[PDB]
Amino acid sequence: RAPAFPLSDIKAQMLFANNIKAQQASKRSFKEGAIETYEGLLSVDPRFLSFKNELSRYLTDHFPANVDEYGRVYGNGVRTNFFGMRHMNGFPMIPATWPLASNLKKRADADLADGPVSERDNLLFRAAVRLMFSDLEPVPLKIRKGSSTCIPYFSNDMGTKIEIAERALEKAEEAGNLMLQGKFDDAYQLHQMGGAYYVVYRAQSTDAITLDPKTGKFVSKDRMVADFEYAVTGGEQGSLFAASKDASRLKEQYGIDVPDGFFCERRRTAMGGPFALNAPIMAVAQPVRNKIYSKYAYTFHHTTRLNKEEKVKEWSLCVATDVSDHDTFWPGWLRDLICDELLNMGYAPWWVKLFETSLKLPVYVGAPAPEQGHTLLGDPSNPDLEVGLSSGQGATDLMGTLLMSITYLVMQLDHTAPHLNSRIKDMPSACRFLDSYWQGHEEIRQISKSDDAMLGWTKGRALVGGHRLFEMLKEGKVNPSPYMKISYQHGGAFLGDILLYDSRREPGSAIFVGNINSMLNNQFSPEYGVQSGVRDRSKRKRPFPGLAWASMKDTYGACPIYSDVLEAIERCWWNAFGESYRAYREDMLKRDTLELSRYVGLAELTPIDLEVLADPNKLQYKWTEADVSANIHEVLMHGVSVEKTERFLRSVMP
């Protein structure tokens, strides 16, 4: 049972430096409220809400999901209903979950191993660690603009961040060594490395909604959560119940109009790391990305839909997988294994302790619901939580791939390719086979970014077993992996793009198109608002919203129903607004096109560049620095001197 501490306690007090921003953060209470969907327009505006009500009914009606029995998609490309938009963007379900403080039991109760099952697996994992963290080229420590440093200073002034980051890369060794001696408080008080994660709550504005033919009433997807007790005890006591998306309280409290079939939005937990501890970790994680997005680009680097469609055309079978709640599930033991191999490889113990510790840190829960929260979970003096993986750890994306890639590969050997076992006899042979399999220069294949992936089998012996596996995944009775809960994706798609099979449901005559539902989400149910209160747009969550219209075609036009939907959209946006959506959007576009230039027409920019500028969160799951124009990059990022990261990195590696 995890130690808990009220905001009042000395232990949580020193999470928050002596200034307003920081103190405000320790204290900050629940906050709901309509979002400025677009400039001058509220998410709960009676017209906008009526627009949604009709657009979703009509679209789900005239274009029902065309999805296979094996979760392959065909026909119109619609993988589901359009009811997503039926949320009161800004008003959150209540309560949000308390971050679970130990997944040890969660994993057990799920039948997932507490470590590698077989020495083979133990080799493949360690191989991944080797191939990932070896032969690294130093780069600048690129700092995202606008981002917070969280515990302890809670600043978001680039100048301050640069200084902290540089300072960190200096005294990072001193601190790691201090952690090795077990003096974590000493390390934190001297270098603000340790302490805790800061538990914000992100919105996810497009969770599931269904329309019961029986009921005729709408049905929000149930989303379970943990009351404090459940979370501190990893599931022993406490209860795990569903939160209320019921949006009526919206009327009572704020007098707002609540149409039939609208709900509050799902809220996922998000963590914010002590920047001073992420700095030394990012200086390494970024190079690692570089090595893999190049050398092992077949399985890891994903840009354009051709780039995807190409690799898959060659496959004889394609299986889109899916991972349940990947993050709260991430094995604690993989961290310890990854940390061992690093040590073995010769990585400097101190830097591994920073890494080890960054994955065992207490989390500070802010505001799950009104009158809940303001609590530190676990003791910063001796960090030992098993949160799983934390959204804001320096290497969090790599941590998902390292795990999940091997997990899949194993799943392939396990059910399709036993004859490759001979190939993995020892460490060296392991890498060799891994280094092979990761380039896709092998008969079983994989493209993946952490929890999203598609698995492929070329012609060959495995090919038959592959099909067996597909079947095991359809019946969904047996879990194929011992490491994570894995299933097929009902409506197969990879990194935002839908795989559109055809008449012959074969990966050859398949083609990647974009998800049309995603467009409707981006355009009408935005994560954040326009932030007019914020002056510098590069500091805003959506800097140049208009710009997305420019890349609409270059992105969604590939969809079977793209045209119709643009016409449906335009139509309904008339019945509700009198105006013309196309005009409204073109009006936004022209505006921000001028505005943009003070921060650097669009002749130059790429189709991506725009999507990024309209929402830079797509650097956080979709694309990468290499994918964006180097001059557009400096608008959303600023780095730390390369001299400084190079010297640092030189002390870390072997």
**Phi, psi angles (nearest 5°) of residue 291:** -50, -45
What number of other Cβ atoms are within 10 A of residue 511's Cβ?
Answer: 18
Stretch that binds Mn ion, among 138-146, 291-299, 445-453, 470-478 (CB under 5 A): 445-453
CB of 400 to Mn ion, least distance (A): 14
Of 278 and 517, nearer to Mn ion (C-beta) is: 517
Half-sphere exposure of 421 (CA within 13 A, CB side): 13
Interaction between residue 452 and Mn ion (CB under 5 A): yes
> Closer to Mn ion at the Cβ: 386 or 452?
452
Of 220, 216, 249, nearest to 83 by C-alpha is 220
Q: What is the closest distance, in whole angstroms, from the C-beta atom of residue 268 to Mn ion in the complex?
A: 18
Long-range interactions of 155-160: CB distance < 8 A, separation 24+:
155/21, 156/539, 158/638
Minimum gap (Å) between residue 451 Cβ and Mn ion? 8
Q: Which is nearer to Mn ion, 304 or 631 (CB)?
A: 304
- The answer to whether 201 is a known ligand-binding residue is no
Cβ distance to Mn ion smaller for residue 321 or 525: 321
Q: Contact, 71 vs 491, CB < 8 A?
A: yes
Q: Where are the alpha helices (DSSP H) in 314-348?
A: 326-329, 332-345
> What are residue 198's phi and psi, to 5 degrees?
-115, 110
Strand pairing category for 317-323 and 452-457: antiparallel
The size of the interface with Mn ion (CB under 5 A), counted in residues, is 3
- Listed ranges 211-219, 341-349, 450-458, 544-552: which one lies at the site for Mn ion (CB under 5 A): 450-458
> Rounded to the nearest whole angstrom, what is the least distance from the CB of residue 537 to Mn ion in the complex?
33
**Of the two residues 25 and 320, which places its CB atom closer to Mn ion in the complex?**
320
Taking the complex as a whole, the smallest distance from the CB of residue 327 to Mn ion amounts, in Å, to 16
Q: Which residues contact 600 (CB under 8 A, 6 or more apart)?
A: 631, 632, 635
Residues 6+ positions from 649 with CB-CB distance below 8 Å: 136, 138, 283, 284, 287
Q: How far is the CB of 489 from Mn ion (least distance, A)?
A: 4
> Would you say 358 or 489 has its CB closer to Mn ion?
489
Between CA 433 and CA 431 the distance in angstroms is 5
Q: Which is nearer to Mn ion, 87 or 301 (CB)?
A: 301
Shortest distance (Å) from residue 318 CB to Mn ion? 11
Distance in angstroms (rounded) separating the CA atoms of residues 391 and 460: 39
Paired tokens of 232: 């501190």
CA distances from 202 to 275, 316, 367 (A): 19, 39, 12
* Contact call for residues 367 and 351 (beta carbons, < 8 A): no
Q: Which is nearer to Mn ion, 53 or 489 (CB)?
A: 489
Closest distance of CB 534 from Mn ion, Å: 34
What is the footprint of Mn ion within residues 83-122 (CB under 5 A)?
none
The residue (of 130 and 302) whose beta carbon lies closer to Mn ion is 302
Q: To the nearest whole angstrom, how small is the minimum distance from the Cβ of residue 320 to Mn ion?
A: 4
Could you say whether residue 67 binds Mn ion (CB under 5 A)? no
Per CB under 5 A, the segment of 194-202, 337-345, 421-429, 448-456 that binds Mn ion is 448-456
* Residue 274: both structure tokens together: 């002590």
- How open is the CA angle 632-635-639, to the nearest 5 degrees? 100
Which tokens hold the place of 90? 């800004």
Which positions from 162 to 181 touch Mn ion by CB under 5 A, shown as an x/- string?
Answer: --------------------
Q: Which is nearer to Mn ion, 442 or 452 (CB)?
A: 452
- The nearer residue to Mn ion, 479 or 489, going by C-beta atoms, is 489
Q: Which helix H or strand E contains 639, and what residues bound it? A: strand 637-640
Q: Cα(462)–Cα(415) distance, rounded to whole angstroms?
A: 8
Under rule CB under 5 A, residue 446 binds Mn ion: no
DSSP notation for 458-525: -SSSHHHHHHHHHHHHHHT-S-S-SSS-EEE-SS-EETTEEEE--TT--SSS-EEEE-HHHHHHHHHS
Residue 322 or 414 with smaller CB distance to Mn ion: 322
Q: Is residue 492 annotated as involved in ligand binding?
A: yes
What SS3 class is residue 261?
A: coil
**Residue closer to Mn ion (CB basis): 205 or 448:** 448
Q: How far is it, in rounded angstroms, from Cα 56 to Cα 218?
A: 12
Angle at 201 between CA 196 and CA 207, to 5 degrees: 145
Report the C-alpha gap between 352 and 395 in whole angstroms: 12
Enter the tokens of residue 509: 């005559």
- Rounded to whole angstroms, the Cα distance separating 632 from 640 reads 17
Specify the stretch interacting with Mn ion by CB under 5 A; choose among 100-108, 364-372, 447-455, 571-579: 447-455
**Contact set for Mn ion, span 470-509 (CB under 5 A):** 489
Q: Which residues pair with 521 in a beta bridge?
A: none
**With respect to Mn ion, which residue has the nearer C-beta, 559 or 613?**
559
Region at 79 (left for phi over 0; alpha for psi -120 to 50; beta for the rest): alpha
Closest approach, Cβ 493 to Mn ion, in A, equals: 5
Please give the structure tokens belonging to residue 396: 């969090």
Q: Residue 488 annotated as binding? A: yes
Task: Give the per-residue contact string, 302-331, with Mn ion (x = CB under 5 A; - = no).
Answer: ------------------x-----------
CA 518/CA 527 separation, integer angstroms: 12
**Contact characters 267-306, Mn ion, x per CB under 5 A:** ----------------------------------------
Distances (CA, A) of 267 to 34, 225, 589: 15, 10, 30
CB of 435 to Mn ion, least distance (A): 25
Taking the complex as a whole, the smallest distance from the CB of residue 321 to Mn ion amounts, in Å, to 6
Q: Least distance from C-beta 454 to Mn ion, angstroms?
A: 6
Specify the stretch interacting with Mn ion by CB under 5 A; choose among 15-23, 135-143, 449-457, 499-507. Answer: 449-457
Picking from 583, 603, 608, 584, the residue whose alpha carbon sits closest to that of residue 593 is: 603
Smallest distance from the beta carbon of 499 to Mn ion, in angstroms? 9
Contact footprint for Mn ion (CB under 5 A): 320, 452, 489
Annotated binding site: 451, 488, 492
Annotated binding site for Mg(2+): 451, 488, 492
